[PDB]
């Protein structure tokens, strides 16, 4: 037919029972929304909700990758500019435009280089959207609570060592110099929690 | 059933969309059900109908009713489709099972009739889901070689 199977006449075609009770979800995903823009949840580019996602958290650093416009950004010509700066600082009796010529050559090339890198990077955005991005559909991996289950596995271990007792328990922090300020008969180092 | 949902297109703009649940059937062994959310009443009716023809199921009537119990749940709705001497079911479920041409089926939704969730939607989707899980006897026999 003339358009997508996941999108009917009035908006996104409502499959699950959540869509029938909440059918704002069909026609509005945000302020970057158009009607052709339903079912493709990502909107155009340079546009609101255009950002691709990686394991659910959106990719907002793209330029920083190819080293265009970043603090860590790749610099094309250094040796030139340093050489020329040295020339300027040394003396005023002789003026070297030879250095400024090597440099302006370098720059003249740099322009085209950069346009190339930018173009290749936009191709990367396209590829990343096709073959990698989940389009914001999977749970965040990037903050510690998302990994809670992992930490649980560790707490469990420290519990089975303790005879399956103290869960989430840790040793009492003692003092800066607990070991040498305490008399014979008192614990000088922090014990296992079950051992208290 | 018909129903009304509010659809917010923007923080000012608000539309009243309506909601249809229906089922197409023919007692000759073929039925199907659909639901839709549309702008007008007629619109949602037509949408629901083509959604119901998209989902059409059929039933092998060589056996005239299920020969074993089918225990299956739609979302939150636990359904039992079992063999009976006659058709026994809630009025609606009953003429849904009549839409398939079942003589000997009998069917129950959610243990006690007062059990949540209960909606007209749920009542329909349940029995259709159940029937869609049913295996014909011939199919079972070939299945074991």
């Amino acid at each position: 037919r003339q358009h997508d199977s996941g999108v009917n006449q009035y908006g996104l075609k409502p499959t699950n029972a959540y869509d029938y009770i909440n059918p704002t979800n069909l026609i509005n995903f945000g302020r970057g929304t158009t009607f052709d823009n339903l079912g493709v949840r990502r909107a155009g580019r340079g546009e609101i909700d255009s950002s691709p996602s990686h394991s659910g958290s959106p990719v907002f650093t793209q330029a920083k990758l190819i080293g265009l416009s970043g603090e860590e950004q790749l610099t094309m010509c250094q040796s030139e500019t340093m050489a020329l700066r040295l020339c300027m600082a040394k003396a005023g009796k002789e003026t070297c435009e030879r250095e400024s010529r090597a440099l302006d050559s370098c720059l003249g090339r740099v322009g085209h280089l950069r346009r190339a890198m930018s173009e290749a990077c936009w191709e990367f955005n396209d590829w990343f959207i096709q073959n990698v991005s989940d389009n914001h559909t999977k749970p965040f991996q990037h903050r510690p609570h998302d990994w809670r289950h992992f930490y649980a596995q560790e707490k469990l271990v420290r519990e089975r060592q303790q005879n399956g007792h103290a869960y989430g328990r840790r040793p009492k922090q003692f003092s800066f110099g607990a070991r040498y300020v305490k008399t014979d008969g008192y614990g000088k180092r922090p014990r296992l929690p079950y051992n208290k | 059933a018909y129903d009304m949902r509010v659809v917010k297109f923007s923080p000012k703009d608000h539309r009243q969309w309506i909601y249809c649940v229906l089922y197409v059937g023919s007692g000759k062994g073929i039925a199907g059900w659909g639901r839709a959310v549309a702008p007008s009443t007629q619109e949602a009716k037509k949408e629901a109908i083509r959604e119901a023809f998209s989902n059409i199921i059929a039933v092998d009537l060589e056996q005239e009713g299920p020969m074993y119990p089918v225990r299956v749940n739609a979302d939150g709705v636990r359904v039992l489709l079992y063999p009976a001497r006659r058709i026994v079911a809630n009025f609606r479920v009953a003429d849904i099972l009549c839409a398939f041409g079942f003589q000997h089926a009998g069917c129950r939704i959610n243990l006690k009739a007062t059990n949540n969730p209960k909606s007209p939607t749920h009542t329909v989707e349940g029995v259709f889901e159940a029937v869609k899980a049913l295996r014909s006897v011939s199919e079972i026999a070939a299945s074991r070689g």
Partner: peptide
């Protein structure tokens, strides 16, 4: 506690874990 809801709040979301806890 107050025996009623002071706020009228209806979330429409139905996470599959909340509903069928037998399987998740």
């Amino acid at each position: 506690l107050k025996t009623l809801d002071v706020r009228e709040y209806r979330p429409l979301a139905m996470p599959i874990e909340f509903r069928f806890y037998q399987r998740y």
